[PDB]
Amino acid sequence: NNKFKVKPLPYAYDALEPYIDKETMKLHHDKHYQAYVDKLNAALEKYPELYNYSLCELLQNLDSLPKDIATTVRNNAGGAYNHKFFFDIMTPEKTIPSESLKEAIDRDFGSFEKFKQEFQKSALDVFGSGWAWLVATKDGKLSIMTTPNQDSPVSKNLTPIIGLDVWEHAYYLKYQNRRNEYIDNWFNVVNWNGALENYKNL
Amino acid sequence: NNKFKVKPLPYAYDALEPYIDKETMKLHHDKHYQAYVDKLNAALEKYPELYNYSLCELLQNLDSLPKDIATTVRNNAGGAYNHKFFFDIMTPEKTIPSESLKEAIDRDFGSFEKFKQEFQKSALDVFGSGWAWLVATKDGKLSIMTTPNQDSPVSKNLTPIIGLDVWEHAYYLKYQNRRNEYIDNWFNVVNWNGALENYKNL
Ligand SMILES: [Mn+2]
Ligand SMILES: [Mn+2]
């Protein structure tokens, strides 16, 4: 069976409390993430050879896929990729920026504090559903950008280092309309070691 | 004071229970709707003469507004218009389709049941944040379409008859990911008399 799979949550559903509630983690992972994978797999039944692409390859080739599934794949491979990434980039363990990522952040933003302010603002200003991202060019240059819906920096040949889901389903149960509190709290669970790995893998 | 105003909710905050929860009505009206109006007003301080436009006029002229506020107005006048419309198009009173609207629905969709199935499906398939609409051309022809974010049929010279908010903030507290249940329940609170007025005002 070479269909796409939901990656099991890498920690307990209540591991990110009190920053993200257990109920949200259950819905977010077991309903939302699950639905993107299911829909992706269903769309691909017509072209089974596409099961042999990685999520990245699908996302890097949206404009050359068969016209009749291009949009579905964009949305659902996007959802599948983004959520796998998002759950991996959070952790109950305490982590901090180190090594080349730590240096790159200081270099490209001036300081970690300045980077964090810019990131929070970009995340706050996303209008509608979307994501805020710290991304790297192939040469390791860092910047912050956002994508709408389940669109991914990957489709623009940018490499995601960290990323924050600001779809309302990611924060509404606990924060309601207060996305700023969500964004601020989320920095307590960012997995900086996983971010470092993402940056090294360029 | 000719600034744009939040229209007070036309019924009690718990009037739509058990279809829409009181907590959501409070947040939706007092936080979300309120924020669109505030942001609209703030953007317009630079061009105070625009306070003399109606919401419709702003939305019908997004492409000719001064470049530096066009997007903000699109988003926030859209939010202000859509929500005023949405709260008006729901009611605790029992209503049903009648007169010319009732006839138009049968004419353009075959039956009320067929219209409802198509509407529910369009609302279910909105990807990301958006709205489903029953709209009329100037000659009274009916169709169903959707807009993303706070975009409005008004900007395409279509007249909204009824419309459903499918931003996740509109249903997440009570329905979580189960948008289908939200959509199905919402038909119990649709104000068909207000819809008739909307259709007559062509
Ligand atoms: Mn999500
Ligand atoms: Mn809304």
Side-chain angles (χ1 to χ4, degrees):
Chain A
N1 187 107
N2 59 341
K3 291 177 165 185
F4 293 93
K5 304 285 162 52
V6 161
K7 178 163 171 179
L9 199 66
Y11 33 78
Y13 287 85
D14 62 5
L16 308 181
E17 306 213 333
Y19 311 108
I20 301 173
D21 52 294
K22 180 184 189 179
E23 296 63 35
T24 291
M25 299 297 312
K26 285 263 181 189
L27 292 166
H28 205 184
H29 180 280
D30 297 358
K31 303 298 173 183
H32 298 269
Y33 178 21
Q34 184 68 68
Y36 295 124
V37 174
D38 294 348
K39 288 178 196 295
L40 178 59
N41 284 148
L44 296 194
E45 281 168 22
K46 188 181 183 177
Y47 304 103
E49 71 192 276
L50 293 179
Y51 288 122
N52 294 323
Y53 284 33
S54 62
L55 290 175
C56 271
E57 283 172 321
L58 291 171
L59 296 176
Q60 282 163 340
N61 291 279
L62 297 169
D63 295 325
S64 53
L65 293 171
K67 308 292 178 218
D68 70 306
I69 61 170
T71 291
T72 307
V73 170
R74 172 187 176 174
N75 293 338
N76 298 103
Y81 182 87
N82 295 343
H83 286 87
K84 177 198 299 172
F85 180 99
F86 182 61
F87 299 132
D88 281 345
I89 206 56
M90 294 186 293
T91 186
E93 302 179 298
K94 291 195 156 290
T95 70
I96 63 172
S98 71
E99 304 179 34
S100 54
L101 180 45
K102 176 179 165 71
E103 298 170 17
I105 287 168
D106 283 351
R107 180 193 71 209
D108 298 341
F109 302 96
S111 65
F112 178 84
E113 192 48 49
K114 284 174 182 171
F115 149 76
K116 181 178 171 186
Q117 293 180 31
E118 180 176 343
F119 187 96
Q120 297 213 226
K121 193 192 203 316
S122 293
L124 192 61
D125 294 347
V126 168
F127 190 83
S129 309
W131 292 78
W133 306 95
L134 175 67
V135 297
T137 55
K138 250 70 203 293
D139 77 307
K141 181 72 179 176
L142 294 177
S143 60
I144 293 163
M145 46 101 72
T146 66
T147 55
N149 305 319
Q150 297 304 346
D151 292 352
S152 166
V154 161
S155 305
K156 290 179 167 176
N157 304 123
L158 294 160
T159 297
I161 307 303
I162 76 175
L164 177 58
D165 193 353
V166 295
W167 283 57
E168 284 170 328
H169 67 236
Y171 64 85
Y172 215 77
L173 292 188
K174 180 175 179 75
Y175 299 97
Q176 299 75 55
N177 62 297
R178 303 177 308 279
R179 189 198 295 176
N180 65 314
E181 295 178 2
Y182 168 60
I183 296 165
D184 186 63
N185 271 18
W186 179 76
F187 276 92
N188 299 114
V189 303
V190 173
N191 185 349
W192 290 107
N193 299 334
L196 176 58
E197 282 321 297
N198 290 339
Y199 186 75
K200 285 181 162 170
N201 290 353
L202 288 178
Chain B
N1 187 107
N2 59 341
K3 291 177 165 185
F4 293 93
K5 304 285 162 52
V6 161
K7 178 163 171 179
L9 199 67
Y11 33 78
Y13 287 85
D14 62 5
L16 308 181
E17 306 213 333
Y19 311 108
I20 301 173
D21 52 294
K22 180 184 189 179
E23 296 63 35
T24 291
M25 299 297 312
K26 285 263 181 189
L27 292 166
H28 205 184
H29 180 280
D30 297 358
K31 303 298 173 183
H32 298 269
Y33 178 21
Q34 184 68 68
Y36 295 124
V37 174
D38 294 348
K39 288 178 196 295
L40 178 59
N41 284 148
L44 296 194
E45 281 168 22
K46 188 181 183 177
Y47 304 103
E49 71 192 276
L50 293 179
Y51 288 122
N52 294 323
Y53 284 33
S54 62
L55 290 175
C56 271
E57 283 172 321
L58 291 171
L59 296 176
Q60 282 163 340
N61 291 279
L62 297 169
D63 295 326
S64 53
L65 293 171
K67 308 292 178 218
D68 70 306
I69 61 170
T71 291
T72 307
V73 170
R74 172 187 176 174
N75 293 338
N76 298 103
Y81 182 87
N82 295 343
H83 286 87
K84 177 198 299 172
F85 180 99
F86 182 61
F87 299 132
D88 281 345
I89 206 56
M90 294 186 293
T91 186
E93 302 180 298
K94 291 195 156 290
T95 70
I96 63 172
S98 71
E99 304 179 34
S100 54
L101 180 45
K102 176 179 165 71
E103 298 170 17
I105 287 168
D106 283 351
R107 180 193 71 209
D108 298 341
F109 302 96
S111 65
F112 178 84
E113 192 48 49
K114 284 174 182 171
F115 149 76
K116 181 178 171 186
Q117 293 180 31
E118 180 176 343
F119 187 96
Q120 297 213 226
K121 193 192 203 316
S122 293
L124 192 61
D125 294 347
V126 168
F127 190 83
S129 309
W131 292 78
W133 306 95
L134 175 67
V135 297
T137 55
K138 250 70 203 293
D139 77 307
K141 181 72 179 176
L142 294 177
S143 60
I144 293 163
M145 46 101 72
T146 66
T147 55
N149 305 319
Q150 297 304 346
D151 292 352
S152 166
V154 161
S155 305
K156 290 179 167 176
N157 304 123
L158 294 160
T159 297
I161 307 303
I162 76 175
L164 177 58
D165 193 353
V166 295
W167 283 57
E168 284 170 328
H169 67 236
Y171 64 85
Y172 215 77
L173 292 188
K174 180 175 179 75
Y175 299 97
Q176 299 75 55
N177 62 297
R178 303 177 308 279
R179 189 198 295 176
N180 65 314
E181 295 178 2
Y182 168 60
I183 296 165
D184 186 63
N185 271 18
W186 179 76
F187 276 92
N188 299 114
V189 303
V190 173
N191 185 349
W192 290 107
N193 299 334
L196 176 58
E197 282 321 297
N198 290 339
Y199 186 75
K200 285 181 162 170
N201 290 353
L202 288 178

